[PDB]
Amino acid sequence: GLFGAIAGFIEGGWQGMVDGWYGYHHSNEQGSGYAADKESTQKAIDGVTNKVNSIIDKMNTQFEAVGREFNNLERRIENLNKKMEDGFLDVWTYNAELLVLMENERTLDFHDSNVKNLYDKVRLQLRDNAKELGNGCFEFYHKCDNECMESVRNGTYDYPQYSEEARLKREEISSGR
Amino acid sequence: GLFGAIAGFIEGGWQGMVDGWYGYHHSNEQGSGYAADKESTQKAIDGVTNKVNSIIDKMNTQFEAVGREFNNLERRIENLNKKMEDGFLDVWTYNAELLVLMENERTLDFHDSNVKNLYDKVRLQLRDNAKELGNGCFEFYHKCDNECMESVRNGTYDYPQYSEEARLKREEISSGR
Amino acid sequence: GLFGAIAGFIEGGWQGMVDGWYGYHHSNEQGSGYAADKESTQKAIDGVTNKVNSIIDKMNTQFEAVGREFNNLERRIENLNKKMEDGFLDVWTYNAELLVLMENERTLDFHDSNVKNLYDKVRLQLRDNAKELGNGCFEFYHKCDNECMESVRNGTYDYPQYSEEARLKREEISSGR
Amino acid sequence: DPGDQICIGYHANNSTEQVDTIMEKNVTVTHAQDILEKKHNGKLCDLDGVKPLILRDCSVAGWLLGNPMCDEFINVPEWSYIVEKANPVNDLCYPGDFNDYEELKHLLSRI
Amino acid sequence: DIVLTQSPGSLTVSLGQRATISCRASESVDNFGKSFMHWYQQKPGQSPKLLIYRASNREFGIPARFNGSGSGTDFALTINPVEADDVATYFCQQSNEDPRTFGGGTKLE
Amino acid sequence: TKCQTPMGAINSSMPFHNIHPLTIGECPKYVKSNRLVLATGLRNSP
Numbered sequence: 001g002l003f004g005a006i007a008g009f010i011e012g013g014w015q016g017m018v019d020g021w022y023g024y025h026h027s028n029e030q031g032s033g034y035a036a037d038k039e040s041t042q043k044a045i046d047g048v049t050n051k052v053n054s055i056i057d058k059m060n061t062q063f064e065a066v067g068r069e070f071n072n073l074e075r076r077i078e079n080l081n082k083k084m085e086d087g088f089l090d091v092w093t094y095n096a097e098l099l100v101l102m103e104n105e106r107t108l109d110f111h112d113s114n115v116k117n118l119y120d121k122v123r124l125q126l127r128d129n130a131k132e133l134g135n136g137c138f139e140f141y142h143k144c145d146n147e148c149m150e151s152v153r154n155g156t157y158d159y160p161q162y163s164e165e166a167r168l169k170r171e172e173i174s175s176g177r
Numbered sequence: 178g179l180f181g182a183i184a185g186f187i188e189g190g191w192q193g194m195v196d197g198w199y200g201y202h203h204s205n206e207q208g209s210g211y212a213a214d215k216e217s218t219q220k221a222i223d224g225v226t227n228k229v230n231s232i233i234d235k236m237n238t239q240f241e242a243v244g245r246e247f248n249n250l251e252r253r254i255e256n257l258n259k260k261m262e263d264g265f266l267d268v269w270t271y272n273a274e275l276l277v278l279m280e281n282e283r284t285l286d287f288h289d290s291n292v293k294n295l296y297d298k299v300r301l302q303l304r305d306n307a308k309e310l311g312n313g314c315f316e317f318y319h320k321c322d323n324e325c326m327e328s329v330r331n332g333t334y335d336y337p338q339y340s341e342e343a344r345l346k347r348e349e350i351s352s353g354r
Numbered sequence: 355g356l357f358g359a360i361a362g363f364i365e366g367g368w369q370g371m372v373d374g375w376y377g378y379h380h381s382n383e384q385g386s387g388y389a390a391d392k393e394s395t396q397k398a399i400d401g402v403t404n405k406v407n408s409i410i411d412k413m414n415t416q417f418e419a420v421g422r423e424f425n426n427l428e429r430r431i432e433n434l435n436k437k438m439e440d441g442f443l444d445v446w447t448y449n450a451e452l453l454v455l456m457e458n459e460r461t462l463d464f465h466d467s468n469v470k471n472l473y474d475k476v477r478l479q480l481r482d483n484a485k486e487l488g489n490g491c492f493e494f495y496h497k498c499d500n501e502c503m504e505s506v507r508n509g510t511y512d513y514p515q516y517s518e519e520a521r522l523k524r525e526e527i528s529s530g531r
Numbered sequence: 532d533p534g535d536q537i538c539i540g541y542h543a544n545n546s547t548e549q550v551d552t553i554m555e556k557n558v559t560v561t562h563a564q565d566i567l568e569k570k571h572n573g574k575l576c577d578l579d580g581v582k583p584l585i586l587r588d589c590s591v592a593g594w595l596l597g598n599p600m601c602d603e604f605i606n607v608p609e610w611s612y613i614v615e616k617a618n619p620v621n622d623l624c625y626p627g628d629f630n631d632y633e634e635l636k637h638l639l640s641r642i
Numbered sequence: 643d644i645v646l647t648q649s650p651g652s653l654t655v656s657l658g659q660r661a662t663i664s665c666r667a668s669e670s671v672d673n674f675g676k677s678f679m680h681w682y683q684q685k686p687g688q689s690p691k692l693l694i695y696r697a698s699n700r701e702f703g704i705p706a707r708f709n710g711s712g713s714g715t716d717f718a719l720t721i722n723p724v725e726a727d728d729v730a731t732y733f734c735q736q737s738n739e740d741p742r743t744f745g746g747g748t749k750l751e
Numbered sequence: 752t753k754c755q756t757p758m759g760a761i762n763s764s765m766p767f768h769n770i771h772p773l774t775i776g777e778c779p780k781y782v783k784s785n786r787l788v789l790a791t792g793l794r795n796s797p
């Protein structure tokens with residue numbers, strides 16, 4: 001949307017990742033699979049949860065109509081009473097409707113942001129040890145087994161440890177053979 | 178502004194591109210020229226138009242003063258009527274002005290987002306088949322004619338097809354000329 | 355947060371940079387040190403300052419309660435007076451509180467944006483004359499003395515002047531040392 | 532051997548100032564601005580120049596009709612506001628009623 | 643100190659005419675939009691008496707013959723028409739800023 | 752003061768106050784809130 005990730009350079013989502021909002025798909029000799037990023041997914045949940053609660057909470061005090069009756073010669077204050085009570089119903093309704101519209105935009109873009117940011121987390125870890133494919137995926141220049149995959153997902157990826165194997169591949173690759 | 182594109186790393190806009198808000202300038206042996214990206218421009222127009230309509234529409238019901246008259250010993254309700262009616266004019270005036278200011282920011286930041294995302298659509302297509310110059314432009318490592326330009330602008334750029342020609346050029350560049 | 359720079363890919367801030375909100379840490383043969391980009395920091399101060407005034411100014415007119423007394427058989431208008439006056443206090447309190455909550459988010463993300471944009475300003479200056487390390491730092495492929503650092507901080511960095519030295523190091527890097 | 536470095540970064544300090552956000556409460560920030568005044572001085576004062584008419588145990592009725600116990604207020608100089616207790620002891624010493632009393636008080640709000 | 647200087651020092655005016663006594667403040671005596679000047683009358687052989695507060699308004703029980711006027715740095719007490727029982731020395735005093743300071747005083751004949 | 756409240760006078764530059772809604776003079780604007788603080792600076796690390 002604003003951050004260009006959800007329905008942007010990452011086109012469409014993964015029907016097959018059910019245990020979180022954001023995560024990874026990996027693919028190597030040892031198989032393939034989906035995996036949620038727990039911490040980002042949790043931050044999203046904390047955020048949206050606090051957000052929904054804050055909306056509920058701020059609307060807690062708010063105008064409460066009361067019935068008052070008036071006789072046939074108290075029409076002016078009866079009208080003044082109606083227009084007053086309607087006046088506030090209109091205000092709170094505007095505030096409520098407009099808050100929802102504005103916060104939905106914020107929520108959707110929040111997610112868009114979260115995803116870009118998760119993508120950028122991997123990007124700046126791997127650097128030139130992997131090739132940016134343009135679709136949300138990275139292709140390693142070195143072998144990355146299930147242990148290595150987990151290291152990327154949890155912040156523990158050691159660049160120096162693989163940097164040698166990576167540079168060796170690019171060399172073969174650059175000459176064209 | 179927020180996304181750093183409009184009046185940021187792309188400094189100033191193009192007086193000579195009239196058929197859209199965002200687009201391309203290309204430059205090769207066969208000449209130069211401007212071209213709008215129809216799809217982003219239309220989404221922007223769609224976006225801003227719905228926004229303006231949504232603003233008009235939410236302000237549709239809103240307090241409407243009515244004249245009521247009062248005699249010389251109804252000074253208290255005459256005042257309560259006045260302050261009440263004024264009370265709502267102030268709320269709605271606040272609502273209108275603040276809505277305009279907040280949405281202007283959103284609109285301006287919206288555009289900034291659209292240009293960044295368009296640049297990034299090109300960036301992740303070309304990758305190392307072109308060189309990022311830092312000013313909003315890409316310089317190709319291979320010849321890209323009028324047909325090839327069109328393929329980039331509309332999502333159709335074939336990376337594997339030029340990737341061979343690009344790596345050959347980078348080698349000459351490495352020798353230093 | 356939204357732009358992923360503050361408390362994101364740059365984890366935590368610099369206690370030792372006192373003369374600004376955003377800035378640089380450099381480290382070379384002649385020592386190490388903090389500096390600040392005055393100009394970006396200033397735009398932020400200008401921005402936040404206008405924002406705070408704009409909040410104060412729009413809240414300038416706003417409902418002002420007045421005391422009115424009513425006798426033991428004007429209970430209905432007395433209640434209508436109470437509820438009316440309370441009604442506006444609740445509305446303005448909502449407007450004020452929500453404005454604070456909403457603009458804080460904008461303000462904090464503003465800063466986050468400002469730091470990313472500054473990083474990106476530097477990133478697209480240096481290109482492959484430096485190595486992106488991923489934590490907010492760049493490691494140069496060439497020698498960068500105190501004059502050279504200042505040139506980076508002020509947008510003055512000359513890429514062509516070092517590009518020859520940078521490519522020579524990468525060459526030694528490819529060889530393995 | 533290591534090479535030179537430049538880092539981009541941002542201010543931190545020993546502030547424990549805290550702001551709220553729609554998504555997050557109690558966010559700790561480098562700098563902040565309070566905009567609510569919660570303090571007053573507990574006294575009734577002269578307003579711009581002008582001392583208020585502080586009736587003591589007299590009521591507004593008591594004063595205008597000139598209940599004997601309100602003699603202190605027989606002839607008052609220009610005032611800025613009037614101050615009245617919730618239940619003035621010295622009101623209508625002779626029991627009764629004060630017509631459109633509230634409408635009159637309303638008139639005083641402009642005098 | 644806000645030095646208050648009245649002029650003239652002594653004023654002899656014909657019966658049924660206009661007495662015009664001036665006051666001049668070293669610095670202004672005039673904020674909040676009101677002037678904090680006061681005029682006082684000392685009929686001979688007795689304590690001073692309050693005529694005008696905040697430079698323009700008469701104290702209760704003062705005849706209209708006394709015109710309080712002025713703003714800022716200079717003011718004027720105007721007695722017109724002058725009556726018999728107006729022999730006194732007249733004082734202007736400011737309250738704008740401690741220490742409370744008085745004028746020299748003007749004796750009317 | 753420039754501002755008086757039934758519980759006491761206010762001497763303040765703040766845009767808001769929470770003392771009492773019935774004021775006279777040149778006052779800040781009354782709200783029911785206990786706390787109102789704008790962010791100006793940025794998010795603090797430790």
Ligand SMILES: *[C@@H]1O[C@H](CO)[C@@H](O[C@@H]2O[C@H](CO)[C@@H](O[C@H]3O[C@H](CO)[C@@H](O)[C@H](O[C@H]4O[C@H](CO)[C@@H](O)[C@H](O)[C@@H]4O)[C@@H]3O)[C@H](O)[C@H]2NC(C)=O)[C@H](O)[C@H]1NC(C)=O
Nearest residue numbers: 144145146147148149150151152153154155156157158161
């Ligand atoms: C983030 O993910 C990282 C990647 O998994 C974790 O680093 C790894 O931590 C341990 C170090 O003790 C280790 O992972 C184990 O996973 C293997 C799966 O096949 C396992 O077979 C290894 O050996 C195990 O089994 C043998 C016997 O068969 C025993 O001798 C071992 O003691 C063990 O029980 C292996 O130990 C990896 O060495 C290491 N990764 C790398 C790349 O070195 C991080 O711990 C994790 N961080 C957090 C905070 O969770």
Ligand SMILES: *[C@@H]1O[C@H](CO)[C@@H](O[C@@H]2O[C@H](CO)[C@@H](O[C@H]3O[C@H](CO)[C@@H](O)[C@H](O)[C@@H]3O)[C@H](O)[C@H]2NC(C)=O)[C@H](O)[C@H]1NC(C)=O
Nearest residue numbers: 321322323324325326327328329330331332333334335338
């Ligand atoms: C996006 O625009 C592209 C440029 O027009 C377009 O690709 C083009 O489509 C066909 C491929 O079959 C070719 O069009 C014809 O052009 C010349 C005219 O002189 C003919 O002689 C050719 O034989 C050919 O039939 C273009 O060569 C081709 N251009 C490129 C760079 O591939 C895409 O189709 C457009 N995208 C979509 C989704 O429609």
Ligand SMILES: *[C@@H]1O[C@H](CO)[C@@H](O[C@@H]2O[C@H](CO)[C@@H](O)[C@H](O)[C@H]2NC(C)=O)[C@H](O)[C@H]1NC(C)=O
Nearest residue numbers: 368369370371372373542543544545546547797
């Ligand atoms: C925040 O407080 C800490 C602790 O009070 C400061 O740390 C001190 O730093 C000075 C010099 O920078 C040293 O001489 C002290 O020994 C440090 N104190 C301790 C306990 O180690 C820190 O500098 C403060 N930060 C700011 C921005 O003022």
Ligand SMILES: *[C@@H]1O[C@H](CO)[C@@H](O[C@@H]2O[C@H](CO)[C@@H](O)[C@H](O)[C@H]2NC(C)=O)[C@H](O)[C@H]1NC(C)=O
Nearest residue numbers: 050547548549550551555556557558559785786
């Ligand atoms: C935000 O921080 C404030 C200040 O630390 C918290 O206020 C405290 O609330 C607890 C119980 O909730 C009380 O025991 C303390 O006395 C409060 N502190 C003060 C100074 O009054 C507040 O609870 C925090 N809010 C959230 C949502 O975490």
Ligand SMILES: *[C@@H]1O[C@H](CO)[C@@H](O)[C@H](O)[C@H]1NC(C)=O
Nearest residue numbers: 392393504505507508509510
């Ligand atoms: C940045 O450097 C240029 C060239 O040295 C100079 O003209 C300009 O004033 C500098 N700007 C700042 C803010 O120091």
Ligand SMILES: *[C@@H]1O[C@H](CO)[C@@H](O)[C@H](O)[C@H]1NC(C)=O
Nearest residue numbers: 698706708709710711712720
């Ligand atoms: C006081 O003197 C001024 C100036 O001559 C005059 O305009 C004003 O009417 C006088 N005030 C009264 C109450 O006569």
